[PDB]
Write a protein that binds this ligand. Sequence first.
Ligand SMILES: OC[C@H]1CN[C@H](O)[C@@H](O)[C@@H]1O
Ligand SMILES: [Br-]
Ligand SMILES: [Br-]
Ligand SMILES: [Br-]
Ligand SMILES: [Br-]
Ligand SMILES: [Br-]
Ligand SMILES: [Br-]
Ligand SMILES: [Br-]
Ligand SMILES: [Cl-]
Ligand SMILES: [Cl-]
Ligand SMILES: [Cl-]
Length: 836
Amino acid sequence: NDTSEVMLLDTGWEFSQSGTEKWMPATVPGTVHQDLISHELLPNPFYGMNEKKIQWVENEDWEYRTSFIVSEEQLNRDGIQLIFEGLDTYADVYLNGSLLLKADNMFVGYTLPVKSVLRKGENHLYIYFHSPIRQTLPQYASNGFNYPADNDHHEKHLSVFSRKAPYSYGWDWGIRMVTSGVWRPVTLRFYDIATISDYYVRQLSLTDENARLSNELIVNQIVPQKIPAEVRVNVSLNGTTVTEVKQQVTLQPGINHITLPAEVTNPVRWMPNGWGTPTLYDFSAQIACGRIVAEQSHRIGLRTIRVVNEKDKDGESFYFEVNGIPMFAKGANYIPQDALLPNVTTERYQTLFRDMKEANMNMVRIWGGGTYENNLFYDLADENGILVWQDFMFACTPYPSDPTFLKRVEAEAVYNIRRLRNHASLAMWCGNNEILEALKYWGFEKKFTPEVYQGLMHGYDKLFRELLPSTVKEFDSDRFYVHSSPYLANWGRPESWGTGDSHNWGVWYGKKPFESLDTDLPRFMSEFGFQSFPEMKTIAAFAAPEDYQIESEVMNAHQKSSIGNSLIRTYMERDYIIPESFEDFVYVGLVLQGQGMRHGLEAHRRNRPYCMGTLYAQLNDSWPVVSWSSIDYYGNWKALHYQAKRAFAPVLINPIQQNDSLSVYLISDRLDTMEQMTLEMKVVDFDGKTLGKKIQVHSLEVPANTSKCVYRAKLDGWLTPEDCRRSFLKLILKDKSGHQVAESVHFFRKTKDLQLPPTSVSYQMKQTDGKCELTLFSSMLAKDIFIETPLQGARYSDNFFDLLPGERKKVIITSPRIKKGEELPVNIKHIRETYK
Ligand SMILES: OC[C@H]1CN[C@H](O)[C@@H](O)[C@@H]1O
Ligand SMILES: [Br-]
Ligand SMILES: [Br-]
Ligand SMILES: [Br-]
Ligand SMILES: [Br-]
Ligand SMILES: [Br-]
Ligand SMILES: [Br-]
Ligand SMILES: [Br-]
Ligand SMILES: [Cl-]
Ligand SMILES: [Cl-]
Ligand SMILES: [Cl-]
């Protein structure tokens, strides 16, 4: 780094309910809710009916205080800067009798010059958080109408007035915890001469032969004199200098703009997950005043990302081109990982990225009702090769567009754009989630006067068609912006499906069968989804045995969608026998969500290039709840996660059966063509015996980045209705020499129509520290087996798979909490067991 010193204001904090004069220890970064919980002043907010029991917190004001020492020597540094990375939300900040700041935007980092107010010895920092509810009640009263924000779970929809995480007020998968606090870190920096307020590595061009960069620095000089300095940029890879440039300047008091070109010959490109290595250069800029007074570095990925959104014969395309190659996007919508943001640990972020990488994903949407994520989130996306689609934090309701609200939004857009624009992973900006769809199709025209509706339509344009796009054009001029997701397509209107991106909620809200995903195709799927109850160990975190019915108060409850638990039963009944026990119903509901959802994922990939991506709703959960998530709050992979992994495999054999006939497609996202390939298939009954003979299709090629049909056959004359109920299709793809590159299994009937034999999955266990190895055997098919353990967060090599007749299967379960001796409890479930 440089000669500055940083003091972390992360200890010795206390908090108070205002007007009580009672102080208790606090943890910062943190939240009022966690501080109370930690003194047993709230029940577990996630347990039972306890949501209503914690609401009172949002009606109180909350105070925070800390003290720190400053030395005579520190006070003699040229400048001293206090930085709040995050204040939630209406925060009056006092230091040593000075009001430093009236903060009003959760999404903004505040940098404050404090030398002239600090004192040798003890220094006293106090922060007063006004209730976001009481702060905005007068605002609402003056408004004359209630914004149609159905996700804001209160009679008055105050959320829209505050630049605060929309989901904190509730959501259709979320608990209401309208929290407050110092949500990101506080630092004091003691420094000489200047600081680097911004360092932007702007890529000018990239070819195989050369990368041209422009290093753009904003330097804030704090002393009264003009100061000769040399600006230096070092570009290194893996600890070795690649290129180095320097510039003489004389820094003036105040802001200085410094621009140094640099080039990297024969650059090593950053590639997305599945296409190579996510190579990151180290770019370091230093200010040297004959000592390095200031330094700032960024990890930089050298790549092009173009979003192609052009009129074509099919409507309007919507796809991503990476390093000149169209890349079919495979991923999911990401939501905040906790009701209480500072509770989400480094480990939890690293684990989530591991989950995305291991599921073969190359894209995550940071959906617009959460937060602009922390720097760590983006750093991990950079180093895992995952593209980031970044919504601005507007979701599902129109918002105000008065001048002072828009000045607030402008502050947050400039802050986060400059914060995020150096990440290799950042791929596009999206003005909002679902707001134009909402304005057009959600029945507002009957909920408000014409003049108010006109006001809302004009407000939409001010923010999402003017302010936000101009801010991106200014500060991130080479990145794509689109005003809303979905921008035109609506799920109820087939005429619009060829136009940009879709949120197909035909499945779920429109009750369409999963098979509808085969015919109802988008140019890009930015949302589609299906709910499930999480597994029992998670339920046991939030419900009691008495509450084990699909619509008791508690489940209902932990159901926040406008049609809920009943829909899960409705869909289940189409394809499965509904089990009589709750635990069995939970198991099949996981299998259900997995099988139906992967059917869509497959349909989207199969239909490339018409469709160029699929991002399911949703990756993750913020609390224990029944949701569209593929990984529950405790990090347990649902069926859907293993199925998404399978559906996103770089090479996939996709058998698709419709109108009593089978097609097999070979789908590849590899960058190289596969030549001289052999598809081989056979029908095997549930006892292990082959029906007929092996079918072989030789001489197959799988070109890079294509989906292609290689086999078709009518069922009639091949299999009888009886066989379709009592066998499966095994499929394998192999190269010239017989090496297997891909396999699949196909069933010819719905699971409820299968004549599944009673059967026992036996296993042998070899348990050590951290590790559990199981070998599973069944003489007969066991359908969609779930290997269930009580260890929260335990990870599995595979799970939610069919255990084929006779064919042994190795599964490894890992967890730091696995001890040698202490045999891991294991419960193996499968479909036939769920009914008599
Ligand atoms: O109700 C399910 C989803 C519909 N689309 C929204 O963007 C998302 O936040 C919702 O959870
Ligand atoms: Br200062
Ligand atoms: Br400053
Ligand atoms: Br200047
Ligand atoms: Br990829
Ligand atoms: Br952070
Ligand atoms: Br626009
Ligand atoms: Br069929
Ligand atoms: Cl960065
Ligand atoms: Cl009105
Ligand atoms: Cl099928």
